[PDB]
Amino acid sequence: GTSKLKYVLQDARFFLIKSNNHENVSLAKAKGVWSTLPVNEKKLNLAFRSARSVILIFSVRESGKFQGFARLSSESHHGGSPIHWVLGGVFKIDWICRRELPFTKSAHLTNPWNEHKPVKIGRDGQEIELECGTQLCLLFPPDESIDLYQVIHKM
Ligand SMILES: O[C@@H](c1ccccc1)[C@H]1CCCN1
Numbered sequence: 597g598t599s600k601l602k603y604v605l606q607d608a609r610f611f612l613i614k615s616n617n618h619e620n621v622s623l624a625k626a627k628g629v630w631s632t633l634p635v636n637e638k639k640l641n642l643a644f645r646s647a648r649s650v651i652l653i654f655s656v657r658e659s660g661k662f663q664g665f666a667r668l669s670s671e672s673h674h675g676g677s678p679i680h681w682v683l684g685g686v687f688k689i690d691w692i693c694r695r696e697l698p699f700t701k702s703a704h705l706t707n708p709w710n711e712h713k714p715v716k717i718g719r720d721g722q723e724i725e726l727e728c729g730t731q732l733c734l735l736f737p738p739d740e741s742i743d744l745y746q747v748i749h750k751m
């Protein structure tokens with residue numbers, strides 16, 4: 597079904613994350629963490645405090661695809677377990693979908709906060725307007741390995 601997914605996304609904010617390599621997205625998928633540049637870290641911390649869900653939608657540059665999406669479970673924090681990224685604070689994230697979506701499937705979605713360009717277009721950290729972001733997340737193939745019960749309880 598899609599009902600719990602729609603519930604998690606209700607009144608959410610959405611941000612495009614552009615990564616330079618699959619290895620870092622793989623690490624994020626395995627460890628449930630993300631780290632970004634200071635300008636985006638500040639924006640995400642602000643969004644985390646005000647919105648009931650903040651959703652990161654990931655895309656590896658030149659892949660032509662999104663690799664999935666996740667919900668922030670914390671603000672950024674320093675001093676924790678180190679992460680062997682491929683070269684700020686660390687956000688904890690809960691994955692909602694670890695399956696890919698090709699850009700060809702989102703060609704009908706425009707992002708008002710980026711001049712109504714197709715939603716695949718955007719710098720790392722670009723905010724995606726609510727309706728566009730909701731519809732983008734609903735386009736991903738269902739990830740039947742995920743149980744959103746525990747995510748709902750964190751809201
Ligand atoms: O956001 C990126 C970045 C690039 C340069 C300086 C700080 C942060 C990368 C780093 C690991 C995962 N995300």
Ligand SMILES: O[C@H](c1ccccc1)[C@@H]1CCCN1
Pocket residue numbers: 708709725
């Ligand atoms: O998407 C809409 C928009 C965005 C930018 C210019 C005109 C119209 C509005 C914005 C808030 C709610 N929806």
